[PDB]
Design a protein around this ligand. Structure first.
Ligand code: HEM
Ligand code: HEM
Ligand SMILES: *[C@@H]1O[C@H](CO)[C@@H](O[C@@H]2O[C@H](CO)[C@@H](O[C@@H]3O[C@H](CO)[C@@H](O)[C@H](O)[C@@H]3O)[C@H](O)[C@H]2NC(C)=O)[C@H](O)[C@H]1NC(C)=O
Ligand SMILES: *[C@@H]1O[C@H](CO)[C@@H](O[C@@H]2O[C@H](CO)[C@@H](O)[C@H](O)[C@H]2NC(C)=O)[C@H](O)[C@H]1NC(C)=O
Ligand SMILES: *[C@@H]1O[C@H](CO)[C@@H](O)[C@H](O)[C@H]1NC(C)=O
Ligand SMILES: *[C@@H]1O[C@H](CO)[C@@H](O)[C@H](O)[C@H]1NC(C)=O
Ligand SMILES: *[C@@H]1O[C@H](CO)[C@@H](O)[C@H](O)[C@H]1NC(C)=O
Ligand SMILES: *[C@H]1O[C@H](CO)[C@@H](O)[C@H](O)[C@H]1NC(C)=O
Ligand SMILES: [K+]
Ligand SMILES: [K+]
Lengths: 446, 446
């Protein structure tokens, strides 16, 4: 009995649209804002139920979430029970070993009172909806910043900007999702505040909400590509295939989405396209030593860093259920143009492109923030490996701008390290709370 | 005669696409810019020939034009024979009785070196093409400003923001256009620099170009609509019907495109859509006194102010050929979102919409500038009327921000004045030269 009628769509199902806009606003007139929040927004906020039926999917799907300062501006002083949310992402940046100096300037503070997520299959429709929202609210709000995002073109649809199939792996909410082979299975309360086994006491009105960690993460695609080529493990055959292999071993999947744990030496596109198979692994293999074998998947690969499965205990055969509480739901969408001829030929980025990163979780210290700082950025995670130093996550791992020392990537010697420049650059973001839909025309507009 | 392979398509035929972007740039590094102008831009500039064939429409249509300062940045010091162009449009603002205070800051100066016009059926395609251009030119080009424009949706396609069908009336170029009934017929040299009967000496490389007068004109649609309702002449017809009549008498056409001169009391949508009938008039009528009769069409109506036809003498029967030299080719396209419910409910604009106005002419002083100052803004034009005070063009007439005095609009009393707020607000623009295509990889790249 998850009340999915009351849970904003993006949290659990995604927006299921081709285009999205992230519209970051300030509140100038609380009393006026509340009237329109309740009269005009509340009724068109799309729920999990609504979005889960192609029939009830609106022309423009709308979610809305508030920052700590946004809640304060609405006179909402209740403790939501999350100190990271409360203090905002800017004050948290040092945890991830970046400086707000590279952030979108409007992220580098707490001026942003909220974000509106618009999703639609054309940008035209999105723009008409922005117009409609702005004229409705009038002077009661100001736009501080916005970021447009879309599913990438054609064959690359649902792939991110480095070209890897994305959205494969999510936590399955016990009692809501039908678990796929290999998929972790977790209490609703890991993602939904006040949900089953959420140990943190919430204001009653906040029950059915989630915390949104937003991140604007630029990707240097041409530079990535060239680095793969330059450091492709010796072997055969073609240089591109060995570059692809190395790419794969960095992420933990081929670009087709085939997990390398199941197919370590060559891509398998059909496997990648198969929901019944492509997540059905734990990192354990009979009979290799889990603590020492990186021949299937490096200890430092992105996905193994972010969901370590058998690395943290639990069943060696699918499905592993370890570290449930550290699950996140991901609704990230690529942003920016495709790589151009000029950028590709010069192996140099000129146009900002990347990932509009969106993670949902009931406890920020358990989810995005934990994954970034305690796992991905942690040279000694996961524990109990030989060699002991795993190095940083080659995708997202940060060290105050320094190139990242990453181990295990080279199939023929797992002691062989690489020094890897950042290919993902954080321009920061903010922590929001995505209230249940009843709070929008309810408590928050009170 | 007219080498249409060498004439940029928008000048004579328009871009024939749903979306346009006007990309205003500066040149930072002329040597490098030239390189890419020749190798990258010239080859993809869309000619009149290419655009006139349904099956050779480019995926993205590109035209390009330069300001005086842009030409200078390219080491082209030749006299194009146009003093208004040389000065730029900021210095001309006084002529139109408008303050630069309302101008896009980037237009109020001569820092803009040119404009790239992109046209496509989606904005996605334009966005990717912008990225391609910016990556190719690198730091040698800089974006100073841009305006996105679009054909209006559904049944308003081809209508401007006030809701009137547009693009019905253009000069027919002798030898190029087969004239329609009523259409003015002009020498090619009225539009194309150095073409037939262009009296002005041009640099040889400039033969086959045109002057592009760009204007960003905001339209206050809700305000316009309200003004019509509040000022509609008393009558037995419905309120909406009498409002529409007033609107049509302001424009000189009904929204369907029907010219009121031919149908003064009723819309006729069959007429509006028929290119054979919908321009076939002179303003003359047996036996009415051309000098005093405003029952068919007010002397002050927009199209009558901008093509006076028989008001400037010549044939009383179609086609009238007066004032050929004061003709402009029009490539304007609406911009901004559709009117929202909030704005409509309130009768108040909050979202900027209007017309991205593009006029082409071989002499700025005979075309746009002439039409704005000598005709539209002149309370005594057209001449020889009774009463003498025609008033201003209700659509575009300007009086230093003051309400415009407009006479003749009320069928029942041709002496009856209305004091009309601006419905259109100039946010300025610039005068550019669109060169022949040969010049783009020729002289301008040299
Ligand atoms: C631009 C930067 C990023 C890129 C290119 C990237 C790329 C990917 C790719 C290709 C996958 C595998 C596809 C899939 O399983 O659906 C993936 C999975 C994942 N990523 Fe990221 N990612 C990025 C940032 C992040 C961040 C910042 C986090 C959180 C700290 C994160 C957490 C995850 C998680 C949890 C998974 C799924 C792991 C699993 O279920 O096995 N990623 N990422
Ligand atoms: C946003 C402001 C404007 C609006 C809403 C507007 C509206 C219209 C409309 C509805 C028509 C009739 C369509 C047609 O005959 O093709 C028209 C025609 C025309 N307009 Fe405008 N107009 C605007 C600005 C201008 C300006 C600034 C000029 C020049 C100074 C201009 C010159 C013309 C001309 C020459 C015609 C054709 C008249 C004829 O050949 O009989 N317009 N306009
Ligand atoms: C997910 O992956 C697991 C492997 O980790 C798959 O489990 C395995 O499924 C196969 C069926 O193809 C089982 O094979 C069978 O084994 C029995 C004896 O145990 C034998 O008599 C049969 O001839 C057959 O080979 C295998 O036992 C089983 N292993 C485990 C540990 O469960 C599972 O099928 C995968 N799921 C999907 C949807 O692919
Ligand atoms: C354009 O309008 C003119 C009227 O101004 C039409 O000319 C008239 O046509 C009718 C029918 O042939 C004749 O009876 C009149 O004698 C014509 N008048 C003149 C002065 O020629 C002309 O037919 C119209 N053209 C179109 C295509 O409808
Ligand atoms: C980019 O890198 C690849 C491989 O390193 C190479 O083939 C290509 O020539 C490089 N381009 C430039 C401009 O250096
Ligand atoms: C593995 O790489 C390391 C470099 O860190 C090196 O010391 C060692 O010789 C390599 N192992 C083999 C078998 O070559
Ligand atoms: C808008 O104008 C119309 C016509 O004048 C009027 O009936 C209506 O009350 C106005 N709306 C508002 C909100 O003032
Ligand atoms: C209308 O014409 C002018 C408007 O000012 C006025 O002087 C005259 O008296 C009016 N005539 C009628 C019949 O209303
Ligand atoms: K927390
Ligand atoms: K001139």
């Amino acid at each position: 009995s998850l009340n999915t009628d009351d849970i904003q769509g993006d949290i659990l199902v995604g927006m299921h649209k081709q285009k999205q806009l992230f519209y970051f606003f300030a509140i100038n007139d609380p009393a006026t804002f509340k009237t329109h929040l309740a009269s005009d927004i509340a009724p068109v906020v799309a729920s999990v139920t609504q979005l889960s039926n192609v029939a009830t999917q609106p022309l423009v799907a709308l979610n809305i979430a508030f920052s700590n300062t946004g809640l304060l501006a609405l006179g909402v002083t209740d403790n939501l029970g999350d100190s990271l949310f409360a203090n905002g992402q800017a004050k948290d940046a040092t945890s991830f070993k970046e400086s707000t100096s590279s952030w979108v300037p409007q992220f580098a503070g707490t001026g942003i009172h909220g974000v509106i997520i618009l999703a639609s299959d054309t940008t035209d429709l999105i723009d008409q909806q922005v117009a409609s929202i702005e004229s409705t609210f009038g002077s009661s709000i100001s736009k501080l910043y916005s970021l447009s995002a879309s599913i990438r073109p054609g064959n690359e649809a649902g792939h991110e900007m480095f070209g890897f199939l994305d959205g494969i792996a999510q936590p399955a909410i016990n009692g809501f999702n039908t678990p796929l082979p290999g998929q972790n299975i977790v209490d609703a309360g890991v993602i939904i505040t006040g949900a089953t086994n959420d140990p943190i006491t919430r204001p009653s009105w906040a029950v059915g909400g989630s915390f949104l960690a937003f991140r604007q993460l630029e990707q240097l695609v041409p530079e990535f590509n060239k680095y793969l080529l330059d450091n492709a493990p010796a072997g055969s055959g073609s240089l591109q295939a060995r570059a692809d292999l190395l790419g794969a071993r960095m992420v933990g999947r081929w670009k087709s989405g085939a997990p390398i744990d199941l197919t370590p030496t060559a891509d398998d596109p059909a496997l990648g396209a198969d929901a019944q198979r492509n997540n059905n692994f734990t990192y354990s293999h009979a009979g290799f030593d889990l603590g020492s074998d990186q021949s299937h998947c490096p200890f430092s690969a992105h996905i193994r860093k972010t969901r370590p499965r058998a690395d943290l205990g639990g069943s060696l055969t699918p499905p592993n259920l370890s570290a449930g509480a550290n699950s996140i739901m991901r609704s990230g969408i690529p942003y920016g143009p495709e790589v151009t001829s000029a950028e590709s030929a010069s192996n140099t980025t000129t146009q900002e492109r990347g990932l509009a990163f969106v993670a949902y979780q009931a406890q920020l210290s358990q989810g995005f923030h934990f994954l970034q700082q305690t796992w991905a950025d942690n040279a000694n995670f996961p524990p109990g490996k030989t060699p002991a130093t795993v190095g940083l996550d080659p995708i997202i791992g940060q060290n105050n701008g320094q190139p990242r020392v990453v181990n295990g990537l080279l199939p023929s010697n797992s002691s062989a390290s690489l020094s890897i420049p950042q290919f993902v650059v954080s321009h920061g973001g903010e922590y929001f709370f995505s209230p249940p839909i009843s709070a929008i025309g309810g408590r928050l507009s009170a």
